[PDB]
Amino acid sequence: RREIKIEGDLVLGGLFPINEKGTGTEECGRINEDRGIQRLEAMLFAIDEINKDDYLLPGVKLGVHILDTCSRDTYALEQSLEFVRASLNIPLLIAGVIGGSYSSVSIQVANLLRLFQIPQISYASTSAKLSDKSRYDYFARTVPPDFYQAKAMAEILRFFNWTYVSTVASEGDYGETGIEAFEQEARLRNICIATAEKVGRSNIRKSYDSVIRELLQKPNARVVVLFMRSDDSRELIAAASRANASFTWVASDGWGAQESIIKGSEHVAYGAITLELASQPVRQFDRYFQSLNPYNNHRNPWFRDFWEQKFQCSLQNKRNHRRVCDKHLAIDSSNYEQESKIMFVVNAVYAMAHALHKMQRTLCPNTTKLCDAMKILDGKKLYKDYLLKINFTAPFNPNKDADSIVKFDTFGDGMGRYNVFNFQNVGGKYSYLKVGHWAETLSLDVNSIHWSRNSVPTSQCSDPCAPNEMKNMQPGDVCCWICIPCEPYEYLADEFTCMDCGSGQWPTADLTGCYDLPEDYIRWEDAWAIGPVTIACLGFMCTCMVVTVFIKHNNTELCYILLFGVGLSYCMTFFFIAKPSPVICALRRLGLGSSFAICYSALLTKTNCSPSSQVFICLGLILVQIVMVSVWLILEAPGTRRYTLAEKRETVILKCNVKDSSMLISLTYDVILVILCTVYAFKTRKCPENFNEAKFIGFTMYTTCIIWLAFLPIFYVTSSDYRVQTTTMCISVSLSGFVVLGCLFAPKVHI
Amino acid sequence: KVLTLEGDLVLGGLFPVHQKGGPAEDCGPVNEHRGIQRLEAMLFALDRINRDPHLLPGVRLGAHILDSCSKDTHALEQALDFVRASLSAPTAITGVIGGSYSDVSIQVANLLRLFQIPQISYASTSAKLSDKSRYDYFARTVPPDFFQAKAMAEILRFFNWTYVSTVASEGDYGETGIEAFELEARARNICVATSEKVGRAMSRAAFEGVVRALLQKPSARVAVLFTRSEDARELLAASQRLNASFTWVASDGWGALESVVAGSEGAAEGAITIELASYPISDFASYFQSLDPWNNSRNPWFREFWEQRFRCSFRQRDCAAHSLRAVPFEQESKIMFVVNAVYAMAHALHNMHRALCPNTTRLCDAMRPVNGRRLYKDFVLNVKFDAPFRPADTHNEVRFDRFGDGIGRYNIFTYLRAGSGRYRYQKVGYWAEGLTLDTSLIPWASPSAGPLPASRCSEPCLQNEVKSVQPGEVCCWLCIPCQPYEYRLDEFTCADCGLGYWPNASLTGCFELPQEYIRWGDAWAVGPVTIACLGALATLFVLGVFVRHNATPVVKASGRELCYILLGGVFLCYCMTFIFIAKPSTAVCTLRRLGLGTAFSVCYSALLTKTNRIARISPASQVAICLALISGQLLIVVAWLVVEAPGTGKETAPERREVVTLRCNHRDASMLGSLAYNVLLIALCTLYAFKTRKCPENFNEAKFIGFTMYTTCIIWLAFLPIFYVTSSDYRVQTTTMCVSVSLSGSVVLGCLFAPKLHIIL
Ligand SMILES: N[C@](CC1c2ccccc2Oc2ccccc21)(C(=O)O)[C@H]1C[C@@H]1C(=O)O
Ligand SMILES: N[C@](CC1c2ccccc2Oc2ccccc21)(C(=O)O)[C@H]1C[C@@H]1C(=O)O
Ligand SMILES: *[C@@H]1O[C@H](CO)[C@@H](O)[C@H](O)[C@H]1NC(C)=O
Ligand SMILES: *[C@@H]1O[C@H](CO)[C@@H](O)[C@H](O)[C@H]1NC(C)=O
């Protein structure tokens, strides 16, 4: 095998994927130009700069021992044993291992190293399982894990008010872990997940078309959350382009700003918000790497193979198939681009160097060279004390922005700094643009964002509706709620439902707008009541004329008492009014009852033929009965009828609700008794007066009995409203007055 | 020192041959019981397997046994050889039979999981090693340490011991078993009251404080122990000093060890300790009592073991006649587990060889690169062989589970007190899969003398004292006596369905009180009957006098039909009053009250038709009108019965039983119309009588008519407020109504008496 061994006071391990993963007999084949060679050269350059530095380990010279992993987990595991065999080919004591570019390789290397207390710092491993310190207690990394971008995307969705999202992921540790993180972080921001699904590694177009069709089923989820790898993202974009659709893709580092995702499908992906890890370019590394040739780089054993594989030429034992490598061939900007994790590798190396420097200054002051008790290094002390607590600026900062500080949290992970991109079109040229940044809080540039179509997507389910019309109710979840109208006679709550504040009130524009209706009975001064009013006026005029003609004659009082009852009967119609009062209704009812009683009892003296005093005493008993009800608590303030079942907008409190129900019954009983007495007395009397007088008395008694019998069913079946209750009473009292007045005056006016 | 043999398949080994020692020496003293005997047991098992024609007849098993020195770092360093023997002349380790301490086993499993090497332990009992996510190539022939928690939970459930006072330990043994027991106690409805944590570095005063904290809860006799061997002797001594009984249910830490109870006899008597079941190996004793440092060159540590146990030297001739046969030898308690692990590995290898090398019994080319994954998943975890060297009668099965753990098999012990001998232990049961004890052998926790109870929640409530209240308790519930006004419909609360009626024995039928609608006994039942009989006799005498006076000029002047109608009405009302004191029913009570009302109406009509003729002075017209009025009143009453006469009466809430009524309960509304009609008729009759009585005819019968008018009306006016007031009370209402009916009849009888007297004289 091949390795890079450099003698020094302190030796750092190394694990890079120099050779890409192979199959068959060959374990590892072709050389990885971007991930293996460039990162290895970056580590060597950082070590050289540290050695040349005078403020970082001045007396201590930093060695190195770099081994290849061949992009294979088992190969890396078997190659990590030389890092631990030195603590038991002369072995070299390894202070720390700066290695691990794949999640599985880093996982197994950490599993092996944690038993021997060897710190390990990774530069490209972003797996979330490596953050579990119970299983990996000597692992650190300068790159953030893969669930920070999920939180960043959730924050973006919350800022853009995209509650109804449609998340689609991939198959594997990456996609599943990220989608789990997304659906455990979105619930904290009241973001719901719709049609959550994942794609597999079947590499079939039918599955992707089915995924697109399933996504198109829901039309309230305009934004789509993608956390899938590059090939899956490209296949999904192609499937969306086929059978054209419209979506707003919120992607992750799998998509990023790579142009490989979009090729021939630059229209469906328009206005896609993507996340890419921020990585400042190291300018000092360009001069170091571009000035490397196989003639002076004798340290790197893989450099010759990398040269022959990149330039497709041969140096020694060249055959006719491959041309001989030409002179003056060197790496230049024409065919060289920096890997996006060179700064991460440099930060890992400098973090290990700073930890070693801090240990050297703490264990023994006033000295530069290596001291006693530092020949053997304690891994726990190096990691948990001098490595997890470092605050230094990133080396080779082009402008020293002061935001690039290398530090590890409690779990050993790095700081999450992502760039928010937006695939837009400017001047007919499709390209990306950094429209935001996510260090600890989201900071977007909304002005330069070009969304799908020409407006910001809504992607919201259950758009709000009027609370007064429809009640907000969530059937199964807070995500979507249906607008269902509530009853129009009840007000609205905060967000729950509609409840009523009792009968007699109606809601208004205000939220708690139910108020008592200021409505009473209907005035009849200029309304339907005309005929009964005219009849009552004519009866009152006739009674006044009868009183006037009777008063003028001086014994040519008993008739005046009967006329007084008629006069007291007349005011009953005037008493009926919509003005509320708890005493007026009872007074009117008692007056009407007393008037009927005295009018009916006035004929007793005529039928039986001192008697005047008894009649007055009998009349007082009826009045005493009427005022007896007022003594008790039967009388009460008027109250609106409880017509909740009836669809009545307003209610009128005018019948006092306790007066009529008993007053009518008592008056009917008294009237029935006196009418029976008068009917019995009329037939018994053998006309103790003029011939016309007895007939007139009999006709008056019959008319009063008939009127009372006709008015009795009206009282029970009145169904008291603003009209019927007053009209029936007015008709009854007018008929009662007319019967007495007519039979009392016609025989008198005739003679 | 490395012990290596030669064979087609080489088996690794890790034994604690040397103790921890400390910083003074590398390893330290040689362990003679856990490092030497177990190593020799593995060697003996390997020899028997190599000489077994039915177990790997062609493949010869080897040995690569190393020393862990009771250290995890040393174990990792030594297992690095097992790693870099199959990874890269190094042998080929197909599996390691090693691991006696939990930390060594964890470290070795962590190292060997990466390189796919199976590991079967023989003495590692821990709950962390059962986590297959971290140790997916680790198996063991011993049950884990959380099975004994289940065993003691079942023991407590069998003896109905719910209120426990368990005491745990500090470290690794106990700090998981106590949580395992607590998890397994909730399923059996066992609640823990007080829990202490005994520590390794702990003062005797702290032990006394712990024991005193056990006295804080009085009704907790039992105490589950998860303490170590050295952490239980101090607790026993403290309990002896404080003179507490405290029957113990201890784990394997106590077992049957005589070094933990000695010096504290008297306080630990009756304890229930459990020890892992292990049978001695007959052949292993003979094999071990045959070795000498001269003929045993395979073991490199046998030299030091012989130098240590036999105090002598080998540089100079000091010990040559010493032999292990003369020395009494006791087998280690985990030798059968070692041989079972070795035989399980051999059986897995044999099964793999059968399933992969079917051509010849020799190791074929296919099985040369032994893989750990397939061997562990398909062969190691699927062995069902009989235990080697088992007792002939006893049937022992060796098999693993989904987690690779061994089969639980514990022995239940009891610390007896011999009548003639001294204190000793004795097995009283076992626990393989289900609980099994010999209850007729425990002397102190015996059922004959009454087993010790630990509930702290008594049940003195059976049917009426049950309340089941618990201020934050789920294992038990205290019942508070509730008032008898409630019923035990539900066994969780006093269902106060009704305060008046008393529930039955079942306390489930919350309905009206079962009783008989009887109210007339001997106090006033006879009195109403006597009054009714006197009224009937007076009516009969009046009828007889009238019959004797039927043919007389005096009777001709007056209307005899009216007198007959009045007599009939009086008889009807008297009969109704007499029968009103009877059991109510659909056709009895309401019919009787309707008849009484009809009789009152008929009496009023008779008075009206008696007074109208006097006032006038066709006679049949008045009789017809009265008959029509009576028929109309009866029809109104009947219509009230058919339409609006629903009747039911029962008092339930205040200290009362069901009211004695069947259908005459709402008769007040039904009789209201009849009462109003009767009042109107009486008023009309009184007015007619007042207007009348001017004519002195029929021997001044108008005086009698006026007497009736002034008597019946006054009686009705006096009774009406009484009837209205008495209507509230059912008992008062009936007697008052009967008395009023009787008085109404009696007034008419007294008024009619005078014409009868005149007829007689
Ligand atoms: N940082 C990565 C992230 C990686 C990844 C990134 C995008 C898409 C797929 C994908 O595959 C998985 C799967 C699980 C965990 C991490 C990843 C790493 O390997 O850990 C990878 C860039 C580093 C490198 O290999 O150089
Ligand atoms: N089986 C044991 C159990 C052991 C143990 C047993 C009783 C008291 C204390 C105690 O210390 C702990 C702590 C944690 C886990 C297991 C134990 C093992 O070492 O795993 C040990 C008997 C085996 C041997 O060493 O021969
Ligand atoms: C999201 O809604 C809040 C709530 O009113 C609003 O303040 C904010 O501006 C919205 N953000 C958008 C529309 O990007
Ligand atoms: C435990 O209680 C049950 C009833 O729940 C009883 O049948 C059993 O005999 C009891 N066991 C004893 C008293 O040991």
UniProtKB/Swiss-Prot annotation, chain A:
**One Gene Ontology cellular component annotation?**
glutamatergic synapse
Q: Which organism is it from?
A: Homo sapiens
Its annotated function is as follows: G-protein coupled receptor for glutamate. Ligand binding causes a conformation change that triggers signaling via guanine nucleotide-binding proteins (G proteins) and modulates the activity of down-stream effectors. Signaling inhibits adenylate cyclase activity.
Q: Does the keyword Chloroplast apply?
A: no
Q: Which domain of life is it from?
A: Eukaryota
> Principal localization?
membrane
What is the name of the protein in this document? Metabotropic glutamate receptor 3
Transmembrane segments annotated in the record for this chain: 529-551, 558-578, 590-608, 615-635, 661-682, 696-718, 729-751
Q: Which amino acid positions bind L-glutamate, per UniProt?
A: 103, 124-126, 174, 253, 341
Q: One Pfam annotation, family name? A: 7tm_3
What biological process terms from GO does the record include? cellular response to stress; chemical synaptic transmission; G protein-coupled glutamate receptor signaling pathway; gene expression; negative regulation of adenylate cyclase activity; postsynaptic modulation of chemical synaptic transmission; regulation of synaptic transmission, glutamatergic
Q: Which residues are glycosylated?
A: 161, 244, 366, 391
Q: Where in the cell is it found?
A: Cell membrane
Hey, which stretches end up on the Cytoplasmic side?
683-695
Q: Name the family.
A: Belongs to the G-protein coupled receptor 3 family.
PROSITE patterns recorded for this chain?
G_PROTEIN_RECEP_F3_1, G_PROTEIN_RECEP_F3_2, G_PROTEIN_RECEP_F3_3, G_PROTEIN_RECEP_F3_4
GO MF term (any one) = scaffold protein binding
Curated annotation (Swiss-Prot), chain B:
GN (gene name): GRM2
The glycosylation sites annotated in the UniProt record are 160, 243, 295, 359, 504
Q: Which residues bind L-glutamate?
A: 34, 38, 102, 123, 125, 252, 334
Which molecular function terms from Gene Ontology are attached? calcium channel regulator activity; G protein-coupled receptor activity; glutamate receptor activity; group II metabotropic glutamate receptor activity; scaffold protein binding
**Function, please?**
Dimeric G protein-coupled receptor which is activated by the excitatory neurotransmitter L-glutamate. Plays critical roles in modulating synaptic transmission and neuronal excitability. Upon activation by glutamate, inhibits presynaptic calcium channels, reducing further glutamate release and dampening excitatory signaling. Mechanistically, ligand binding causes a conformation change that triggers signaling via guanine nucleotide-binding proteins (G proteins) and modulates the activity of down-stream effectors, such as adenylate cyclase. (Microbial infection) Plays an important role in influenza virus internalization.
Pfam families assigned to the protein according to its UniProt record, in alphabetical order: 7tm_3, ANF_receptor, NCD3G
Question: Which residues point to the Extracellular side?
Answer: 1-524, 583-593, 644-668, 727-736
Recite the lineage of the species. Answer: Eukaryota, Metazoa, Chordata, Craniata, Vertebrata
Bilayer topology annotation: Multi-pass membrane protein
Protein name, per record: Metabotropic glutamate receptor 2
